[PDB]
Amino acid sequence: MKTDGEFVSEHLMELITQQNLTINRVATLAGLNQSTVNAMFEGRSKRPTITTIRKVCGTLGISVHDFFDFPPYNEV
Amino acid sequence: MKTDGEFVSEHLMELITQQNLTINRVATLAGLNQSTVNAMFEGRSKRPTITTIRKVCGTLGISVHDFFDFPPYNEV
């Protein structure tokens, strides 16, 4: 019912929002361009990549490991 | 000095090897094709995706969260 891009981008938006940031601000600080940002939240995109997730995590001050501590990714 | 694809694929190979599997066997069980497998370990590829990692993790019986419990991904 949800793609990996959807799980990831929704989690990312939750974390961004908890830090009183915006996706655009994170994009600017993480150095991704609007096209990459837009793709993340386009359901029919294969993005985000690990690289993109890593870069955003850097901006957020969290590890990629911690980023993925949510369902379904933290259960087998 | 290492791409994310290199960090990920090297970790994946360590885990596969610890389970006495081969990358080809995991590929067959996880249902990815040789092209996707080859891309994972091609340094100039942007792959693996989260999807591919998730699928392999399933075959390995581990969570994606646990997959990423190694450096650099488990530090900020």
Q: How far is CA A21 from CA A13, A29, A43, A71, B42, in A?
A: 9, 11, 22, 23, 36
H/E stretch holding B18 reads helix B4-18
Q: Which of A4, A65, A66 sits opposite B54 (nearest CB)?
A: A4
Contact B65 A69 (CB under 8 A): yes
* Separation between Cα atoms, residue B75 and residue B26, nearest integer Å: 28
| Alpha-carbon dihedral sign for residues A40, B71, B15, B3 | positive
Element (H, E) at B55: helix B50-60
On chain A, the residues whose CB falls within 8 A of the CB of B8 are 50
CATH number, domain containing residue B45: 1.10.260.40
Total structural domains in chain B?
1
Assess A14–B contact: CB distance below 8 Å, yes or no: no
* Beta strand residue intervals within chain A, DSSP E: none
CA distance A43 to B56: 22
**Structural domain boundaries, residue A72:** 1-76
**Cβ(B67)–Cβ(A67) below 8 Å:** no
- In a 3-state reduction of DSSP, which class is residue A24? helix
Q: How was this structure determined?
A: X-ray
